[PDB]
């Protein structure tokens, strides 16, 4: 009864960072060996657990967040980070446990004319709470006059699309990011290693 990490790390279509995808992993044996067995993963990185100790402990209520961001925005997926996606798209808590798997996906998430399926939030009056999602596509009012739902000046659409193209440099090429969260809790531990 292996955990469905293959679907998470092998899905054809990831989610946009403003509407990042959430999956609950529980009641299954998880072999994190396959995760590291992926050669191309450019960021197998984390803070509060040793990478070799993943298979040596049993957790409960594992969470997987999948999305796609720029190359230079990967550094914002970390505790205590400020930026665009960290403040308005995906806020990791300061006391985060679990960790982040980022790999280049220019071969898949990029089109010659530009891939406009991936999007991020640019405007928000206040920062996101940790692990909070916002999908409200309401005309952002950056000014006094209420335009009442029509775009224009001082009224902008809060979501902007990445123009992923295959000739972009490393830093603006698409990157697939999966954040695993190991939330220990007072319950029978479910997700154990081999």
């Amino acid at each position, epitope marked *: 009864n292996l955990c469905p990490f293959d679907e998470v790390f092998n899905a054809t279509r990831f989610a946009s960072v403003y509407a990042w995808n959430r999956k609950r992993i529980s009641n299954c044996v998880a072999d994190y060996s396959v995760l590291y067995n992926f050669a191309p993963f450019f960021a197998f990185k984390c803070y509060g657990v040793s990478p070799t100790k993943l298979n040596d402990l049993c957790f409960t209520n594992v969470y997987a967040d999948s999305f796609v961001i720029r190359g*230079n925005e990967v550094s914002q997926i970390a505790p205590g980070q*400020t*930026g*665009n996606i960290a*403040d*308005y798209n995906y806020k990791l808590p300061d006391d985060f446990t679990g960790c982040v798997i980022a790999w280049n996906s220019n071969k898949l998430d990029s089109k010659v004319g530009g891939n406009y399926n991936y999007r991020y939030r*640019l*405007f*928000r*009056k*206040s*920062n996101l709470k940790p692990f909070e999602r916002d999908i409200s596509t309401e005309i952002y*009012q*950056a*000014g*006094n*006059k209420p335009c009442n739902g029509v775009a*224009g*000046v*001082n009224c*902008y*659409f809060p979501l*902007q699309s990445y*123009g992923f*193209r295959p*000739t*972009y*440099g490393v830093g*603006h090429q698409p990157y697939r990011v999966v954040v695993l969260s190991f939330e220990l809790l007072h319950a029978p531990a479910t997700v154990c290693g081999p």
Partner: antibody, heavy 121, light 110 residues
């Protein structure tokens, strides 16, 4: 959109000063607000930025001794410069980033008139 | 640390002719480049967004093209009030890296 400046003058090196930017027709807290300085005779240089959510960033030359803030009550942007050195003599502009009708993301579409700051003994 | 240069440093032009000024980046920046115009004693005004998009209220004689490492600002009929300094600014590097170009000066030729 109007952005009215205030607070310029002449100071001794190692001094301090506060610059004010009073906006109209827009909200300072709801926009990306930048301070951009230009030395007399040289080109434009980005100094500081404050996000709508309150996050701030600074260029490397002014790290530590420059801070940016906002007052929501009367919709103003503030720049407090401390430990001023001679390289800070310039005209400072309050600019709104990522605006304009076609939504020029990353670009400054509305500018103030700028205040003059001089740092010499 | 995206070095950004403008060519030429200053050119002299007449009234009504087409003029092109080029902006070159140390590395490809996609289309994250903007063209500003600043008259003496005044604040800069944003002319071209995203290296190709005309801003609202800007006369149609201003046009922008290019991508990657080379960008160009072209004026078709250089009016007598179009004599100013033109800057190219990139928004590609990082929130702490919005460097500006050197600037190109356009003046009357006699």
């Amino acid at each position: 959109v109007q952005l009215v400046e205030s607070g310029g003058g002449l100071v001794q090196p190692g001094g301090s000063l506060r610059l004010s930017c009073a906006a109209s027709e827009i909200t300072v807290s709801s926009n990306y607000m930048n301070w951009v300085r230009q030395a007399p005779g040289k080109g434009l240089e980005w100094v500081s930025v404050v996000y709508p959510g309150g996050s701030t960033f600074y260029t490397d030359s002014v790290k530590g001794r420059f801070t940016i803030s906002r007052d929501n009550s009367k919709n103003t942007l503030y720049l407090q410069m401390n430990s001023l050195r001679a390289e800070d003599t310039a005209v400072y502009y309050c600019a709104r980033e990522s605006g304009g009708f076609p939504l020029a993301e990353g670009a400054f579409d509305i500018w103030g008139q700028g205040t003059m700051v001089t740092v010499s003994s | 640390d995206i070095q950004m240069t403008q060519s030429p440093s200053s050119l002299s032009a007449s009234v009504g002719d087409r003029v092109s000024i080029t902006c070159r980046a140390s590395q490809s920046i996609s289309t994250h480049l903007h063209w500003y115009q600043q008259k003496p004693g005044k604040a800069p005004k944003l002319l071209i967004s995203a290296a190709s998009t005309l801003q609202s209220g800007v006369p149609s004689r201003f046009s922008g093209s290019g991508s990657g490492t080379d960008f160009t600002l072209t004026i078709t009929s250089l009016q007598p009030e179009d004599f100013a300094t033109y800057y190219c600014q990139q928004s590609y590097s990082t929130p702490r890296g919005l460097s500006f170009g050197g600037g190109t000066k356009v003046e009357i030729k006699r």
